[PDB]
Amino acid sequence: MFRLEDFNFHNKTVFLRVDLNSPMKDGKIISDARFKAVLPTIRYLIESGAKVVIGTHQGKPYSEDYTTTEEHARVLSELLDQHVEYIEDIFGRYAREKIKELKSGEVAILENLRFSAEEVKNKPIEECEKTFLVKKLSKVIDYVVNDAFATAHRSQPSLVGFARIKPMIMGFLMEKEIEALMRAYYSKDSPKIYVLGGAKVEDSLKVVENVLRRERADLVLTGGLVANVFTLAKGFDLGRKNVEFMKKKGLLDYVKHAEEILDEFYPYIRTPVDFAVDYKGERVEIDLLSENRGLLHQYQIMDIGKRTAEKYREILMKARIIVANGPMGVFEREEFAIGTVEVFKAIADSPAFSVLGGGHSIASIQKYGITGITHISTGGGAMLSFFAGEELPVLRALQISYEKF
Amino acid sequence: MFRLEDFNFHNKTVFLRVDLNSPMKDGKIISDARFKAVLPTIRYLIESGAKVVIGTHQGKPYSEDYTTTEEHARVLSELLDQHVEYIEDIFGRYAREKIKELKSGEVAILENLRFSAEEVKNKPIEECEKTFLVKKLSKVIDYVVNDAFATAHRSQPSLVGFARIKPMIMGFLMEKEIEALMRAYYSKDSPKIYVLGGAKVEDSLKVVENVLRRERADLVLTGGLVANVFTLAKGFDLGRKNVEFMKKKGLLDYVKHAEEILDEFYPYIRTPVDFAVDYKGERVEIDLLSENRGLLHQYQIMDIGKRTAEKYREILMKARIIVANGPMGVFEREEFAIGTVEVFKAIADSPAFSVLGGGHSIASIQKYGITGITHISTGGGAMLSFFAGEELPVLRALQISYEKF
Numbered sequence: 001m002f003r004l005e006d007f008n009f010h011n012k013t014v015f016l017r018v019d020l021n022s023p024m025k026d027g028k029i030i031s032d033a034r035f036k037a038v039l040p041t042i043r044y045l046i047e048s049g050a051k052v053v054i055g056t057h058q059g060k061p062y063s064e065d066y067t068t069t070e071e072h073a074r075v076l077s078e079l080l081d082q083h084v085e086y087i088e089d090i091f092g093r094y095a096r097e098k099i100k101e102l103k104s105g106e107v108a109i110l111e112n113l114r115f116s117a118e119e120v121k122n123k124p125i126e127e128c129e130k131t132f133l134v135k136k137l138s139k140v141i142d143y144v145v146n147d148a149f150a151t152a153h154r155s156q157p158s159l160v161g162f163a164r165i166k167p168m169i170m171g172f173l174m175e176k177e178i179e180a181l182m183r184a185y186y187s188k189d190s191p192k193i194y195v196l197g198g199a200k201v202e203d204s205l206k207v208v209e210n211v212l213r214r215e216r217a218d219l220v221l222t223g224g225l226v227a228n229v230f231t232l233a234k235g236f237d238l239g240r241k242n243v244e245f246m247k248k249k250g251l252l253d254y255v256k257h258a259e260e261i262l263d264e265f266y267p268y269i270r271t272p273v274d275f276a277v278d279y280k281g282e283r284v285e286i287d288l289l290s291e292n293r294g295l296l297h298q299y300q301i302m303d304i305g306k307r308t309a310e311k312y313r314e315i316l317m318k319a320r321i322i323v324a325n326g327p328m329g330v331f332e333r334e335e336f337a338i339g340t341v342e343v344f345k346a347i348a349d350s351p352a353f354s355v356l357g358g359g360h361s362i363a364s365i366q367k368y369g370i371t372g373i374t375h376i377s378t379g380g381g382a383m384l385s386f387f388a389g390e391e392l393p394v395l396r397a398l399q400i401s402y403e404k405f
Numbered sequence: 406m407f408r409l410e411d412f413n414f415h416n417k418t419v420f421l422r423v424d425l426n427s428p429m430k431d432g433k434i435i436s437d438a439r440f441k442a443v444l445p446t447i448r449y450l451i452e453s454g455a456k457v458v459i460g461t462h463q464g465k466p467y468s469e470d471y472t473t474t475e476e477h478a479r480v481l482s483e484l485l486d487q488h489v490e491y492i493e494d495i496f497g498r499y500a501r502e503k504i505k506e507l508k509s510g511e512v513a514i515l516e517n518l519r520f521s522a523e524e525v526k527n528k529p530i531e532e533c534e535k536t537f538l539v540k541k542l543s544k545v546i547d548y549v550v551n552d553a554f555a556t557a558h559r560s561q562p563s564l565v566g567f568a569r570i571k572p573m574i575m576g577f578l579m580e581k582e583i584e585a586l587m588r589a590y591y592s593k594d595s596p597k598i599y600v601l602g603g604a605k606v607e608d609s610l611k612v613v614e615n616v617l618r619r620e621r622a623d624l625v626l627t628g629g630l631v632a633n634v635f636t637l638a639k640g641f642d643l644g645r646k647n648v649e650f651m652k653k654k655g656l657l658d659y660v661k662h663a664e665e666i667l668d669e670f671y672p673y674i675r676t677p678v679d680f681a682v683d684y685k686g687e688r689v690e691i692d693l694l695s696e697n698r699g700l701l702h703q704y705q706i707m708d709i710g711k712r713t714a715e716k717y718r719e720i721l722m723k724a725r726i727i728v729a730n731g732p733m734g735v736f737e738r739e740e741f742a743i744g745t746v747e748v749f750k751a752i753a754d755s756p757a758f759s760v761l762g763g764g765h766s767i768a769s770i771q772k773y774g775i776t777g778i779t780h781i782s783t784g785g786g787a788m789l790s791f792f793a794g795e796e797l798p799v800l801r802a803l804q805i806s807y808e809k810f
C-alpha cells in the first residue's frame with residue numbers, strides 16, 4: 001500500500017478523501033475531532049506543494065445532519081490558519097475549473113460528496129470506477145490520498161472508485177489506524193479484553209462471536225444497549241420501559257443471536273450487575289438483584305452502575321490488550337456519563353496496549369481530558385467491521401491500487 | 406390544477422420538469438418521441454418570453470442508460486431550432502448563476518436530475534420541500550411547469566417538492582394526458598376494451614383486477630408476457646424453454662394471481678389462440694388448434710399469431726373506449742413485431758376513443774407510422790399505475806399546489 005513518502009506532490013493535484021462527517025446539532029458541527037485527525041496529512045500535502053482538493057460526506061440524504069460542506073470549509077480554514085475554499089459542486093464544470101485554478105500549497109473542499117446519487121451507493125470497484133463522479137474528477141486530479149478510515153467499511157465511488165485509475169495512497173491517519181487495530185487484533189499476549197457498548201447491537205454481536213470464536217479476545221465486557229440486550233438474553237427482566245425501548249429499535253431481533261452467543265461463550269461475557277435509571281431527571285442506581293429493580297419497569301436505563309464500572313476497572317487494569325467501542329450509557333448527558341468516564345479512565349490507566357473507537361457515539365470524550373489510551377480511533381462502524389473480521393473495502397482498494405501502479 | 410394560461414410568464418424564470426428519459430443504445434438516444442411530446446409546451450413558454458430551465462432525469466444511477474443531459478440538449482436544440490444550452494449542474498453555484506443569466510425566451514437544460522442523491526428517493530412532499538435541490542432552486546425560479554406525465558407516479562423532489570413553494574402548473578402534455586386518460590377510465594359508455602401487453606406482469610395484473618372489479622372494462626385482450634401468464638394460468642401449457650423463461654424473470658410468481666382473476670372474471674379475459682416462435686432467427690407461427698407445437702421445450706415465444714390479431718381487431722372495432730398498453734411481442738425485432746403492428750392498427754381504425762401507452766416498451770412504433778389512435782401516451786408505468794386506480798403523486802401535488810396559490 002502506497003504511503004505519502006512514495007510520491008512527489010509538488011504541483012500535483014491531489015484528491016484527498018477524508019471523513020469529516022461530524023456529529024451536529026441544529027446543523028452546526030459539535031466536534032472537530034475528525035478534522036484534527038487529518039491535519040498531519042493535510043499539512044504534509046500543503047508543505048509538499050500539492051494542490052489539495054478535499055472531499056468528504058456529511059450525513060446521508062434526508063438526515064438531520066445532512067448539510068453542505070461550507071462550515072467544514074471554515075472549520076478547516078481555522079485549524080490550518082489557511083483559507084480553504086468551499087467549492088459548491090462535486091464533479092461538474094464549476095468544480096473542475098475551480099480545481100484547475102488551484103496553485104501549489106492551496107487547499108479547497110468540494111460539496112458534500114453524498115449530494116451525488118452515485119456516491120451514496122455501495123458498489124463493486126468495477127462499477128464505482130465507471131461513475132460520472134470518478135470519470136470526471138479523474139480528468140483533473142493526479143493522485144488520490146485516502147485518510148477516511150471511519151468510512152473504510154463502505155464501498156462508495158469516492159472511496160474505492162479511483163483505485164485502478166489513479167494511484168490511491170494512504171494518508172497518515174489511515175496508516176496509524178490500520179497499524180494500531182492490526183496490532184491489537186493479532187496480539188499473542190493476554191488478557192485481551194474487549195469492551196462493547198453503544199447501540200450498534202447487531203454489529204457488536206458479530207464482533208463478540210468473531211473475537212471469541214477465533215480467540216482474539218479472552219473476555220468481553222458490555223455496556224450501553226449491547227449490555228441491555230445481553231442482560232435480557234441471560235434471563236433478567238429489564239422492565240417494560242426498557243424492553244419496549246429495545247423493541248422500538250428492533251434490537252429484540254438480535255436477542256436471539258445474543259442468547260446463542262451466551263450459550264456458547266457464557267463464561268467469557270460480562271454484563272452489568274447494576275444500572276442507573278433516569279428517575280425524574282435524577283440519576284438513580286438500582287441493583288439487578290436488589291429490590292429497587294422494580295424501578296426498571298417505569299424508568300429507563302441510562303448508564304451502568306458504580307459497581308459494574310468498578311468491576312470492569314479491575315479487569316481492564318490487568319489486561320495486556322484492550323479493544324473498546326462505544327459508550328457505557330447516555331454519554332452526552334452529564335449525569336449519565338459517569339459509567340463511560342470511569343471505564344475509559346480505567347482503559348487509560350491500564351498498562352495495556354489500548355484502542356478505543358466509537359465515532360460519533362463517543363464524541364463527548366472531548367470534555368473529560370482522558371489521557372493514556374494508546375490509540376483512539378476515529379472509527380465507529382468501521383472499527384466494528386474490522387474486529388468482526390470483515391474485509392474493509394477501502395483497504396482492499398488501497399491494496400489493488402498499489403499492486404496496479 | 407393550474408393551466409399555462411392561468412399565468413403570465415413574461416420575463417419569468419420557469420423550471421420546466423419534463424420526462425425526457427429516453428430509450429438508449431450504447432449511451433445514445435434512439436428515440437426522440439418524448440422530446441416532441443413537450444415541444445408545444447416549450448414553444449408557448451418561449452412565446453411568453455419566459456426564462457425556461459428544463460429539468461429531466463435519464464435512467465438511474467449505475468444503469469446503462471444513465472448519462473448526462475448533454476445529448477438531450479442537442480436533440481432539443483434541433484427540434485426547437487433554437488440552441489439549448491447544457492448547464493452541467495443542477496442546483497449548485499454554477500447552476501444558479503447560469504439560470505440567472507437567462508434572457509426572456511431562452512431555453513437551457515440542467516444536468517440529469519438523478520445525479521442528485523435527493524432526487525432519486527420517493528419521499529412525502531413534506532420531506533421533498535426541505536431538500537437542498539428544492540431549497541436552492543426555489544431562490545432562482547418563479548414558476549414550475551410539470552409536463553412529466555411519464556414520471557407522474559413518482560414522488561421525487563423535482564416532481565412534487567416545489568408544490569407548496571411555487572405554483573406548479575400543468576404543461577400542455579400533462580394536461581392532455583390527464584384528460585385523455587381520465588376520459589377512458591370514467592367513461593360510462595361501452596364496450597370498453599382493454600389491451601394489455603408487455604413484460605410488466607405484476608403491474609398489468611393490478612390493472613386487470615381493478616378495471617374488471619370496478620367494471621371500467623367490458624373485456625380484456627392480452628399479449629406479450631402478460632398473455633403467456635394468463636394463457637398458462639388457463640391451464641394451457643407453453644413448453645419448457647418458455648416456462649423456464651417465465652421463472653427466469655419470476656413471472657411464474659404471478660400465475661397464482663392470474664388464476665384468482667380468472668376464477669372471478671374468466672369470461673372477460675381473452676388470451677391468444679395462436680403464437681409465433683423464434684428459431685435461430687426465424688419467425689414460426691403456431692396455432693393452439695393446430696398440430697405441431699414442440700420447439701417450445703427448447704425455444705422461446707416472441708409474438709402473438711395472425712388469428713389472434715384478426716379476432717382482437719374484430720373486437721376492437723366494436724369498442725367505444727379502448728385502453729392499450731405495451732407490445733404484443735418482441736417489438737424491437739422486425740420479424741416479431743407483426744402482432745404488435747397489427748393490433749395497434751386495429752385500435753387506430755376503431756371509431757372508439759382510444760388510448761395507447763407503454764413508454765419505452767413501444768418505442769419501435771416510430772417505424773410504422775400509425776394514425777387514428779386518439780391519444781398516444783408518453784407514459785408506461787405511469788399509465789399502468791393510473792388504470793390500476795392508484796393515486797399519482799404528481800397529480801396530487803398539482804392539486805395541493807393549486808389549493809395553495
Ligand SMILES: [Cl-]
Nearest residue numbers: 060151154381
Ligand atoms: Cl454510512
Ligand SMILES: [Cl-]
Nearest residue numbers: 464465556559
Ligand atoms: Cl423510475
